[PDB]
From a paper:
Here we report on the identification and structural determination of the SMN complex from the lower eukaryote Schizosaccharomyces pombe, consisting of SMN, Gemin2, 6, 7, 8 and Sm proteins. The core of the SMN complex is formed by several copies of SMN tethered through its C-terminal alpha-helices arranged with alternating polarity. This creates a central platform onto which Gemin8 binds and recruits Gemins 6 and 7.
The structures of HsG6/G7 (47) and HsSMN/G2 modules are known but the basis of G8-mediated bridging of both modules has not yet been established. This interface comprises several highly conserved hydrophobic residues of HsG7 (A60, L67, L70, L71, F92 and L97) and of HsG8 (Y205, I212, M215, A218, V219 and F223). A hydrogen bond is established between the sidechain amino group of HsG7 Q56 and the carbonyl group of HsG8 R203. In addition, salt bridge interactions between the guanidine group of HsG7 R63 and sidechain carboxyl group of HsG8 E216 are also established.
Author numbering:
A (entry chain F): 191 to 227
B (entry chain B): 47 to 131
C (entry chain A): 2 to 86
Amino acid sequence: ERPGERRQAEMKRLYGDSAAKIQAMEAAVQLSFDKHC
Amino acid sequence: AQESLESQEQRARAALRERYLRSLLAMVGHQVSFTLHEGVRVAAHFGATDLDVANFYVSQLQTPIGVQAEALLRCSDIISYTFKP
Amino acid sequence: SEWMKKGPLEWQDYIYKEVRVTASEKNEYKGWVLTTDPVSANIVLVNFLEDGSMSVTGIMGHAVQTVETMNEGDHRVREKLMHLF
């Protein structure tokens, strides 16, 4: 089970070539939050 | 061979999302004011938002009744929010 | 509706325009479009205040009723929003 594959496909549908850039951004914003959320 | 319309849409989504995500990061370490239902105006210290749904995790939420040390303001509860970078 | 069914290139064309937004509970906003979150359709406006500072307001996409373009906005707007964060 690879529970994130559906999400990855949707991120590719939405963002195309930029999908990994946007994923990295969302990760980094999370970190900035999770630091002191 | 030209960039498709879909590829252009995807770049615009990514540009829009990047600008939005920067605006959320800009709220870290700031107060945020909210316009809620029934015309209620509150404000708090920003903590986080969810990145799927625009829920806000805040601290020292000031309401017309008192202060709540921690609060989750659900996206369905909010009409607008305002802050000063 | 209407705002929430726009596509990303349509949302993107509002960036740097001055708009009037009407929202739930007869809330009204005028400001310069910074971005639209493509996930939520949340609209993010920037206001240039009289004291020279800037505020940023997010309107929940589900609360938006109408968005009317008021002015097109010049290169100084672009520079201001560029140095916002």
